């Protein structure tokens, strides 16, 4: 140990990341007609506990019928999962929602379902995210959206109100404009712009207010005479290849897994 | 310095699907070894999976009459389900394994007197006949019987199912439903026997058993 | 003479988030469309990328007691064999303690592989006893109470001597099924013959009664961890598995 | 051709299963060609390219998801208000679209089943579990019925990754049914 | 200076199921757009195609 | 982390190094975190070693944001005994830094 | 048989001005779509392309006086350490004199690097004195008035003899932080523990009192320029930083 | 004859001027390793006897 420490017994890796593949394949038997020594061990000892488990004679499983391995985070979370949804009531108004891993913030004012679950499987996250948002209802409604990084000015969260920000400021942080008639959906990438090294969901109050946020999104409508239908917005997030995940946590207990029950 | 032998506390023993972990163990004692009969006491192949499971057995047996109209179903059998029964040795294997996959060989025979005429058709249909055209039974692995010609037929098939194996104790749907219908009315001249009995033989092939179990139902 | 014509195919402006190929963004907010390198600075090099990471870490799924009062051949605990199982729970903070194994598989429709039950005994160098662990191949609902200990030895199983220098017996339950994969029916209203989640049930019998003096507990508790090897799950879905109240 | 249905009220949903069952007669079952074809053999497995045409309405937001055999899903062959968490729905992989911008959707259905294969010719029991590829669910939104009607038509096409094992005797004519309309 | 222009041809968003070339899906529900190998396991090798 | 249970005692504990806060993680899955298991009949000590894991590039002592590590020690299996044995066992916790990188000399204290 | 079909993807006719890849025009007004060569004719060859251009030019951020009346160890001026700082100002024409360094960084969310404080003295070859410049690592809001001069020598700092052939001491404040970059919170309503703009504060102490005869001023003024090296800013934004009224 | 692994009772650990003797020991668990900032969070020499 370079830290000036010494020991007589060893120190092996405990709970090592990505140990085996997630699809049945051959990376004979898997164990058999020999003697299952891995049927007994002293779990308290980290070394011994890694001894491969084996109890009876088995054969090699074989090959899975499907191409890709569904257990590769990149591919799994590659399926843009649900994030949140809101609805505009008056014209020339705006909504601003934060992207917060916080296990504390319960939906709708917080991370829901899968996304909630996923982001609490590990301690640190960093890297871009591909947000995609679906428009529901209205038509011929001009709209705009911008990504605001943690620690900067931005209209009050989880609240529909008249923007209090200079058009200049908004556009300046990089923004996008669209119209319900011509589209009905937007898929744009959110940058890893933060003064932190990474963000986390599992935290306590204080840090849970600064270090638990990727950033924020703000959507502002225009030309929406409410003589028209209603205007709904739904947001979904998908992890990118440039996204990283460090240190595995114990998954959230079921009682804390919540979902925004609707339809 | 001489080391003096002391027993080996922990150890693991077992056979087939039974393992034991012992903490205050010791070694195993054995005497003599396996002896081969210089003069065998029995000349038949020693019992084996094939011996007892992959052999033939009489499933069902019925009659075919002059009264039986065209297409009359002379027999509808859940081949597999039928084998699963104390009546046959193969049971001893099935009765103790939860699931198993396999192929089948069916032999159907009869004994019509050359003074009789007509015929039947025997088909191995997977699952159920559903609403398939009786007239197209030839499509399924079949055997045709004609009095003037043959009095036997043999069909051999592999495992065909939606699942990777059949569950005996409590099945989902029969693997095979062997159907035997009148292919051409069995007529005769005045005086001849107005019938002919019929039997059905079956056996498993490439019998793959899985998961020993104590259940019975 | 500019001449590049293309036909507008079906599914115009349709959105699909089933996979990344269609879920990935089509433009970016990032200046100059830049990207990011890696950086394990404060991540201690522990970079994660596969759920295996969790599914192979024995987590605590259940605790059961072994009493002297338990006679030979008495069924002590019965467990269904499927990743989704777990019964641990703490009163306050009020929570339902799911296992790692479970928390992962709960998000899949199908699964297959060798589930691994680890039994950790908490005795004293002065107790003595043996427990027989027995896997009965089948489905998650098979009456099994009608099984003599003797009867159980027919199914694959293992016995363990508690009194010892070792503490945990590992039960590697071989994938035995009539189907290539089992399904997460724990989402459906009721149950249907054939739509099963487990490949059978596990049983804890009293092999040799628990002996001891009198200045030590009248019993010995046991922890049951659960993890899987050669695990495979596919067909993503969302569901927070509840507790299996045995 | 596979099937067709029509929405009457707003914020409702329909869920139809893809079942080879020769038993289930249309409209609540496989019709015409598809019915015929899937009974020519015993076992099927492999992806399928579903394509669905939208008829009528406009500026109607919609969503659809593929649900594998053996999992939660709104009651079959019935128009009703969904009883499923938006989360759950989207989680199984879903798609969103709008009548104005399109009018048709061609997406591939996966071979996600705990079975080795499925079959049409079966008997009751198995005919309830092993006769289904999976299920599709379509949910509308923003459809003030002051508008026209909203019809949906579904068609299936076999893919190259599809397999067909063991030839059966074709269904007799009396069992070949078609959803007579126009 | 991004300059990729194409003209919108006839038959916009038209659907045709006459053949596979136009009937085949344009996207998939399958995760990661995967595919499937063959498997005659319980099909006894009797693969049909004609 | 070490203890001293008399062989006449039985039961066990679990010790986990959790970054930040336990949040709502499943108590039963504590094994996931860098941990050490204690069982009377077996071991009376456990040792865990970890690197810097945080959201920030360093910890601020004078006025921290959120604790880097929250070491938790819970009863993994009730500690029972026979009539007469000591009904307890004291426990201690040892800690030390590794690869200590200090930065920015300052006169402050709080 | 013309057969080029493409599917209309999401974000139909959407506009994005976040980066150039999507902001650049898709057609041009210029005849024949021509272009232009370079031409420094009347530009004296001074072609600009990087904001560094400004951020490395010491600009005047603040002026403070050093009086004889100031006793040893008396705090003379306190400054937060972040590019955004500047306090200079002229009455009429009414204006708030931002620095180059500042005017640039004000348009970014994040920044990191070595800020450089240049102290220019305006004495006479007849004064004599020393000033101690002290950087106290931290955030933009740390009570520091409770710091003896002596106490300050613990933090990194530098002393300067005013009377001399030289005129400016350069203070290169090393990037010291718990985070890779600091943020432009000067846009937010209030302040939040952790969201800081500076890496600490700089302090000017009186090392040796200002001595002199009597036919020269009773004090000596000092200019404080500010510039940065190894500077890095990213995440564009718009904000006109106001004056930091110390 | 296969020997089956059993923990190592006695052992001695410690660091700098602190030593421990343990009789009912087991091995030490460790995760990940030391990481070097590809982008330093601070450029001053890390604290050392000389530094301070
Ligand atoms: Cl219109
Ligand atoms: Cl308002
Ligand atoms: Cl239009
Ligand atoms: Cl309803």
Domain residue ranges in chain B: 1-217
Which residue bears the tokens 């027995």?
C134
Helix (H) or strand (E) holding D128, with range, is: helix D126-129
Q: Which pair of tokens denotes residue G134?
A: 């002290």
Q: How many CA atoms lie within 13 A of C193 on its CB side?
A: 11
Query: In DSSP terms, which residues pair with B16 in a beta bridge?
Result: none
Q: For chains B and E, tell me whether 3 or more CB atom pairs sit within 8 A of each other.
A: yes
Q: Are strands B116-126 and B142-146 parallel, antiparallel or unpaired?
A: antiparallel
Alpha-carbon gap, residue E43 to B158, rounded angstroms = 8
Alpha-carbon gap, residue G202 to G80, rounded angstroms = 6
Q: For chains C and A, tell me whether 3 or more CB atom pairs sit within 8 A of each other.
A: yes
Considering every ligand atom, which ligand is closest to the CA of D74?
A: 4
Which residue bears the tokens 């089943």?
D113
CB contact under 8 A, E42 and B157: no
User: Is the minimum CB–CB distance between D113 and chain E shorter than 8 Å?
Assistant: no
Alpha-carbon gap, residue D165 to B158, rounded angstroms = 12
Q: How many residues does chain C have?
A: 246
Alpha-carbon gap, residue B140 to B125, rounded angstroms = 6
Helix (H) or strand (E) holding D87, with range, is: helix D86-91
Alpha-carbon gap, residue F34 to F52, rounded angstroms = 13
Our measurement of the distance from residue B177's CA atom to the centroid of its chain's CA atoms, rounded to an integer in Å, reads 13
Touching subunits of H (3+ CB pairs, under 8 Å) are A, B, C, F, G
Chain B nearest C-alpha distance from E22 (Å): 31
Which residue bears the tokens 């995967």?
E34
- What is each CA distance from C60 to B188, C131, C134, C200, C223, in whole angstroms? 77, 19, 19, 20, 7
Task: Work out the number of other CB atoms within 10 angstroms of the CB of residue H18.
Answer: 10
Q: Are strands E7-8 and C5-8 parallel, antiparallel or unpaired?
A: parallel
Residues of C in contact with D91 (CB under 8 A): 107, 236-238
Partner-chain residue, chosen from G10, G12, G15, that has the shortest CB–CB distance to A176: G15
Q: Which pair of tokens denotes residue F26?
A: 């499943």
CA-nearest of C152, C148, C150, C130 to C201 is C152
- What is each CA distance from A150 to A100, A132, D70, in whole angstroms? 10, 20, 43
Partner-chain residue, chosen from F42, F50, F102, that has the shortest CB–CB distance to H46: F102
Considering every ligand atom, which ligand is closest to the CA of D80?
A: 4
Q: How many residues does chain H have?
A: 52
Q: Which residues between 21 and 40 in chain H have a beta carbon less than 8 angstroms from any beta carbon of chain A? A: 25-32, 34
Q: Which domains does chain C have, with CATH numbers?
A: 1-246 (2.60.120.20)
Alpha-carbon gap, residue G67 to A174, rounded angstroms = 49
Residues of C in contact with G8 (CB under 8 A): 8-9, 11-13
Chain H nearest C-alpha distance from F87 (Å): 20
CATH dotted code for B1-217: 2.60.120.20
Residue in F108, F109, F110 to test binding to G, most G beta-carbons within 10 Å: F108
Alpha-carbon gap, residue F49 to F96, rounded angstroms = 10
Residues, CB within 5 angstroms of ligand 2 (ion): A 161-162
Which residue bears the tokens 């090897």?
C229
Alpha-carbon gap, residue D102 to D171, rounded angstroms = 38
- What is each CA distance from A92 to A158, C183, F76, in whole angstroms? 17, 49, 58
Angle at Cα C44 formed by Cα A116 and Cα A11, nearest 5°? 115
Q: Which pair of tokens denotes residue C66?
A: 């072994």
- The radius of gyration computed from the CA coordinates of chain D, to the nearest angstrom, equals 16
Q: For chains H and E, tell me whether 3 or more CB atom pairs sit within 8 A of each other.
A: no
Our measurement of the distance from residue F57's CA atom to the centroid of its chain's CA atoms, rounded to an integer in Å, reads 23
Residues of A in contact with B17 (CB under 8 A): 56-57
- What is each CA distance from B108 to B75, B119, B153, C109, in whole angstroms? 11, 13, 6, 44
Our measurement of the distance from residue D30's CA atom to the centroid of its chain's CA atoms, rounded to an integer in Å, reads 9
Residue B212 CB partners (closer than 8 Å, separation 6+): B17, B96, B97, B98, C137, C154, C155, C156
- Can you say whether the dihedral through the CA atoms of H14, H20, H23, H29 is positive or negative? negative
Q: Which pair of tokens denotes residue F68?
A: 């880097």
Q: For chains C and G, tell me whether 3 or more CB atom pairs sit within 8 A of each other.
A: yes
Phi, psi angles (nearest 5°) of residue B139: -60, -45
Alpha-carbon gap, residue C60 to D152, rounded angstroms = 49
Helix (H) or strand (E) holding A218, with range, is: strand A213-222
Partner-chain residue, chosen from B128, B132, B139, that has the shortest CB–CB distance to D122: B128
Query: In DSSP terms, which residues pair with A238 in a beta bridge?
Result: A130
Alpha-carbon gap, residue G200 to G155, rounded angstroms = 11
Residues of C in contact with D84 (CB under 8 A): none
Alpha-carbon gap, residue A111 to A113, rounded angstroms = 7
Query: In DSSP terms, which residues pair with C149 in a beta bridge?
Result: none
User: Is the minimum CB–CB distance between A209 and chain G shorter than 8 Å?
Assistant: yes
What is the D11 CA–ligand 4 centroid distance (Å)? 10
Name the DSSP class of G64: E
Q: Which residues between 9 and 48 in chain H have a beta carbon less than 8 angstroms from any beta carbon of chain G? A: 39, 41-44
Using H for helix, E for strand and C for coil, what is the string for F36-77?
EEEECCCECECCEECCCECCCCCCCCCCCCCCCEEEEEEEEE
CA-nearest of G174, G163, G173, G178 to G213 is G163
* Alpha helices (H) in chain A, listed in sequence order: 46-50, 73-76, 113-118, 167-172, 207-210
Alpha-carbon gap, residue C207 to B22, rounded angstroms = 13
Alpha-carbon gap, residue B17 to A33, rounded angstroms = 11
Residues of F in contact with A210 (CB under 8 A): 65
Helix (H) or strand (E) holding A95, with range, is: strand A94-100
Alpha-carbon gap, residue C116 to C122, rounded angstroms = 19
Chain A nearest C-alpha distance from C104 (Å): 9
Task: Work out the number of other CB atoms within 10 angstroms of the CB of residue C149.
Answer: 17
CB contact under 8 A, E31 and A65: no
Angle at Cα A90 formed by Cα A85 and Cα A92, nearest 5°? 95
Task: Work out the number of other CB atoms within 10 angstroms of the CB of residue A91.
Answer: 15
Alpha-carbon gap, residue A201 to F49, rounded angstroms = 23
CB contact under 8 A, C122 and F40: yes
Alpha-carbon gap, residue F29 to F13, rounded angstroms = 14
User: Is the minimum CB–CB distance between F55 and chain H shorter than 8 Å?
Assistant: no
User: Is the minimum CB–CB distance between E19 and chain G shorter than 8 Å?
Assistant: no
CA-nearest of C158, C146, C177, C162 to C216 is C162
Residues of F in contact with G177 (CB under 8 A): 57-58
Q: Which domains does chain D have, with CATH numbers?
A: 1-182 (2.60.120.20)
Alpha-carbon gap, residue C230 to G15, rounded angstroms = 48
Query: In DSSP terms, which residues pair with B177 in a beta bridge?
Result: B125
Considering every ligand atom, which ligand is closest to the CA of D82?
A: 4
Task: Name the strands in the sheet holding C5-8, side by side, starting at the edge strand that comes first in the sequence.
Answer: E7-8, C5-8, G5-6
For chain D, the first-to-last Cα distance in angstroms comes to 12
Helix (H) or strand (E) holding A86, with range, is: strand A81-88
Give me the resolution in angstroms, 1 decimal: 3.0
- What is each CA distance from F3 to F15, F88, G73, H22, H24, in whole angstroms? 12, 10, 54, 10, 10
Angle at Cα F47 formed by Cα A48 and Cα F90, nearest 5°? 115
Q: Which residues between 206 and 245 in chain C have a beta carbon less than 8 angstroms from any beta carbon of chain E? A: 234-236
- What is each CA distance from F8 to C65, C121, C129, C215, in whole angstroms? 18, 15, 16, 8
User: Is the minimum CB–CB distance between F43 and chain H shorter than 8 Å?
Assistant: yes
């Amino acid at each position: 140990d370079d830290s000036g420490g010494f020991s007589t017994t060893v120190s092996t890796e405990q709970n090592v990341p990505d140990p085996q593949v997630g699809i049945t394949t051959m990376r004979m038997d898997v164990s058999g007609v020999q003697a299952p020594v891995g049927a007994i061990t002293t779990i308290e000892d980290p070394v011994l506990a890694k001894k491969v488990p084996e109890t009876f004679p088995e054969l090699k499983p074989g090959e899975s019928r499907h191409t890709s391995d569904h257990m590769s985070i990149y591919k799994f979370m590659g399926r843009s999962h649900f994030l949140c949804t809101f609805t505009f009531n008056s014209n020339n108004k705006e909504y601003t929602f934060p992207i917060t891993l916080s296990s504390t913030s319960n939906p709708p004012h917080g991370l829901p379902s899968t996304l909630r679950w996923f982001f609490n499987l590990f301690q640190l996250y960093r890297g871009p995210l591909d947000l995609t948002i679906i428009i529901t209802g209205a038509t011929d409604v001009d709209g705009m959206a911008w990504f605001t990084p943690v620690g900067l000015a931005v209209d009050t969260p989880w609240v529909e109100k008249e923007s209090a920000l200079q058009i200049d400021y908004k556009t300046a942080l990089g923004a996008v404009r669209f119209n319900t008639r011509r589209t009905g959906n937007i898929q744009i990438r959110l940058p890893w712009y933060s003064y932190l090294y990474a963000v986390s969901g599992a935290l306590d109050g204080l840090g849970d207010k600064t270090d638990s946020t990727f950033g924020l999104v703000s959507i502002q409508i225009a030309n929406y005479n409410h003589s028209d239908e209603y205007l709904s917005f739904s947001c979904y997030l998908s992890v990118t290849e440039q996204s990283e995940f460090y240190f595995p946590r114990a998954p959230l207990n079921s009682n804390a897994m919540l979902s925004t029950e609707s339809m | 310095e001489q080391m003096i032998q002391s027993v080996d506390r922990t150890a693991v023993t077992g056979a087939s699907y039974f393992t034991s972990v012992d903490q205050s163990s010791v070694h195993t004692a054995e005497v003599g070894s396996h002896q081969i009969e210089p003069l065998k006491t029995s000349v038949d192949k020693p019992g084996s999976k094939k011996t007892q499971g992959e052999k033939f057995f009489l499933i069902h047996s019925a009659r075919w009459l002059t009264t039986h109209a065209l297409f009359h179903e002379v027999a509808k059998l859940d081949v597999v389900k039928l084998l699963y029964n104390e009546q046959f040795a193969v049971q001893g294997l099935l009765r103790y394994h939860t699931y198993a996959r396999f192929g089948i060989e069916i032999q159907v025979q009869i004994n019509p007197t050359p003074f009789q005429q007509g015929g039947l058709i025997c088909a191995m249909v997977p699952g159920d006949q559903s609403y398939g055209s009786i007239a197209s039974l030839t499509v399924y692995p079949h055997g045709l019987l004609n009095c003037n010609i043959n009095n036997v037929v043999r069909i051999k098939v592999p495992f065909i199912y939606t699942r990777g194996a059949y569950h005996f104790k409590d099945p989902q749907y029969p693997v095979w439903e062997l159907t035997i219908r009148v292919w051409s009315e069995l007529n005769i001249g005045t005086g001849t026997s107005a019938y002919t009995s019929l039997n059905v033989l079956a056996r498993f092939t490439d019998l793959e058993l899985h998961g020993l179990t104590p259940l019975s139902t | 003479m500019m001449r590049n014509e293309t036909r507008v195919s079906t599914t115009e402006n349709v959105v699909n988030l089933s996979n990344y190929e269609d879920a990935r963004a089509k433009m970016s907010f990032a200046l100059d469309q830049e990207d990011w390198k890696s950086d394990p600075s404060q991540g201690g090099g522990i970079k994660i990328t596969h759920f295996t990471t969790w599914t192979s870490i024995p987590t605590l799924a259940a605790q059961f007691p072994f009493n002297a009062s338990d006679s030979v051949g008495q069924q002590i605990k019965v467990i269904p064999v499927d990743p989704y199982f777990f019964q641990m729970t703490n009163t306050n903070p009020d929570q339902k303690c799911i296992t790692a194994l479970a928390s992962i598989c709960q998000m899949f429709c199908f699964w297959r592989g060798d589930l691994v039950f680890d039994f950790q005994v908490f005795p004293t160098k002065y107790h003595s006893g043996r427990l027989l662990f027995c896997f009965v191949p089948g489905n998650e609902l098979i009456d099994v109470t009608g099984i003599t200990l003797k009867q159980a030895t027919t199914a694959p199983c293992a016995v363990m001597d508690i009194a010892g220098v070792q503490s945990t017996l590992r039960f590697r339950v071989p994938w035995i099924s009539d189907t290539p994969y089992r399904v997460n029916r724990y989402t459906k209203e009721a149950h249907q013959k054939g739509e099963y989640t487990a490949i059978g049930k596990l049983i804890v019998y009293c092999y040799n009664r628990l002996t001891s003096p009198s200045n030590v507990a009248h019993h010995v508790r046991v922890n049951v961890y659960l993890s899987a090897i050669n695990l495979e799950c596919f067909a993503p879905l969302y569901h927070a598995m509840d507790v299996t109240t045995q």
